[PDB]
């Protein structure tokens, strides 16, 4: 290898460019090979890799790179915790044709990883934004597995910390509650959302019916990170930003016998 | 005097056309020792990742038995019971064609669910049995585990041993003997002793009859006499009795 490509600053810049404009596989493979042969990887390199890993929302690669960082004895900053918790929250999950998209999540146990990442980020002295907590709660409650007690504890922590609630985690928690048959907790969540003013639950407010008693395949949906259909979103809004419910299709942005630009429309 | 984070070099390059490119490259951070930031909460704490199941075959499958037997007090009765019930659940959930490309590695990342899951489960079962058998089944010298739950655990272990993986791939890095059924002679003897210690072990009910049939099958398979499952007074006065004679004499 020529010295120009052997220079580690070129390694860092090409890795950053790869993370900006490629998939997770490119960055992971390139970083692993570089770490294997020379190219001493630093905290900046690890954060750049975790950026793409969180962007694509994958858990096994994130735990692999976390183990690699532990082996290399690199002290991470809050960006690493943010990236890993966001990747856990953006991990794909879907019940299609009585077949889950990811069967590895149950073995990976990404909820515990997200919880410990949030706890470590709080403990070591780094800022804790609303997105990390919302992603952790999303990991706790999904159609895959039922973890509602820990999610309720985290929601109480958010309530006493005056943190914002995201509609995605609100919807996931509400679905988990109604699936676990806890209408009391579902009603409490609805009241909280209505009071806050979340876009999805601004109007939805209901009275309290439990006024005299104290405390004590199923779902068919698919969830993937934004990056999977960001191109579709961009072209949809570029073509028709005045009719959002238009179902952007072929021949609207490319004539016959010509490529439409985006490979893999609708996956 | 206080530690200062290394700066990032800002370089502005003006292209011949006129497109200015600004870069922030940490050349100083690429070298020198990595500055360590001590956490506010005392010592630096990091998340552990010894519980996630991964496709790598260099380690064993992380099960709750691993975190239960990480150095706890083995004399705790409820801890022993929880370990036993977790092992029972593991065995219950436990109870393949040669591909050239997977010879020098494990099954591919996409085919983890169809080829490597059972192999990992069997390896985990064997490795946990080799460490738990002396806790679930104490050696013969009140007991920490009852005879019924010990029998249930032994039955699940026998089912796992009989349904162990039979096809040995060239990619199997361990010894080929690990793919063979287990030998539970001592465990069956311990179960028989614990069953004969307390009376009224066998009942004419359907569940107790099934348990008796399972015990007879265990004795026949593991070469353990069936006389040990009954008090010696019922067997005293006879030079020797066989398993078939014991079954035909004590069949309800």
């Amino acid at each position: 290898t020529d010295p120009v490509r052997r220079d580690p600053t070129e390694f860092l810049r090409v890795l950053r460019r790869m993370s900006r404009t490629t998939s997770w596989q490119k960055t992971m493979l390139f970083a692993s090979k570089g770490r294997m042969v020379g190219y001493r990887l630093t905290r900046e390199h690890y954060n750049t890799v975790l950026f793409s890993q969180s962007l694509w929302g994958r858990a096994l690669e994130i735990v692999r790179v976390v183990r690699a960082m532990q082996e290399d004895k690199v002290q991470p900053n809050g960006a690493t915790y943010y990236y890993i918790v966001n990747g856990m929250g953006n991990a794909d999950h879907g019940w299609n044709y009585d077949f889950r998209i990811n069967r590895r999540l149950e073995k990976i146990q990404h909820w515990r990883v997200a919880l410990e990442a949030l706890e470590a980020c709080e403990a070591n002295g780094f800022d804790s934004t609303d997105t990390m907590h919302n992603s952790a709660l999303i990991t706790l409650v999904i159609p895959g597995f039922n973890r509602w007690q820990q999610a309720s504890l985290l929601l109480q922590r958010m309530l006493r910390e005056d943190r914002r609630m995201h509609p995605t985690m609100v919807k996931f928690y509400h679905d988990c509650l109604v699936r676990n048959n806890r209408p009391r907790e579902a009603s409490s969540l609805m009241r909280l959302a209505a009071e806050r003013g979340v876009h999805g639950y601004e109007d939805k407010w209901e009275a309290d019916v439990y006024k005299g008693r104290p405390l004590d395949t199923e779902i068919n949906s698919v969830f993937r990170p934004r990056v999977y259909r960001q191109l579709w979103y961009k072209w949809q809004h570029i073509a028709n930003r005045y009719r959002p419910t238009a179902a952007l299709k072929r021949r609207q942005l490319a004539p016959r016998d010509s490529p439409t630009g985006i490979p893999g429309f609708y996956r | 005097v206080p530690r200062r984070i290394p700066g990032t070099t800002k370089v502005t390059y003006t292209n011949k056309k006129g497109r200015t490119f600004s870069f922030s490259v940490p050349v100083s951070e690429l070298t020198h020792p990595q500055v360590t930031l001590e956490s506010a909460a005392g010592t630096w704490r990091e998340m552990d990742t010894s519980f996630c199941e991964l496709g790598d075959i260099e380690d064993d499958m992380p099960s709750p038995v691993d975190e239960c037997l990480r150095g706890g007090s083995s004399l705790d009765k409820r801890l022993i019971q929880e370990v036993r019930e977790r092992f029972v659940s593991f065995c219950r959930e436990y109870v393949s064609t040669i591909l050239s490309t997977e010879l020098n590695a494990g099954p591919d990342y996409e085919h983890y669910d169809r080829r490597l899951r059972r192999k990992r489960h069997w390896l985990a079962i064997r490795h946990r049995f080799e460490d738990v058998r002396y806790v679930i089944w104490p050696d013969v010298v009140n007991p920490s585990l009852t005879a019924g739950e010990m029998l249930e655990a032994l039955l699940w272990l026998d089912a796992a041993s009989t349904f162990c993986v039979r096809k040995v791939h060239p990619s199997d890095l361990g010894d080929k003997s690990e793919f063979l059924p287990l030998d539970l002679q001592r465990e069956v003897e311990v179960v028989a002793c614990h069953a004969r210690r307390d009376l009224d072990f066998f009942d004419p009910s359907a569940t107790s009859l099934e348990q008796f049939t399972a015990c007879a099958a265990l004795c026949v398979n593991h070469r353990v006499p069936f006389s040990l499952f009954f008090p010696a007074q019922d067997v005293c006065g006879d030079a020797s009795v066989s398993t078939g004679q014991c079954i035909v004499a004590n069949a309800p």
Binding site: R35, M36, V37, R40, R67, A68, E71, D72, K73 | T31, H32, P33, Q34, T36, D56, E58, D59
Partner: peptide
């Protein structure tokens, strides 16, 4: 996993957490 993580990896002069610049300290 430790063998794979340490595969083709060697300690560096400056990558050690207890390293100091310059490495040997007597007494554009």
């Amino acid at each position: 996993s430790t063998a794979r993580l340490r595969l083709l990896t060697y300690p560096m002069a400056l990558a050690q957490p207890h390293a100091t610049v310059p490495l040997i300290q007597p007494t554009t």
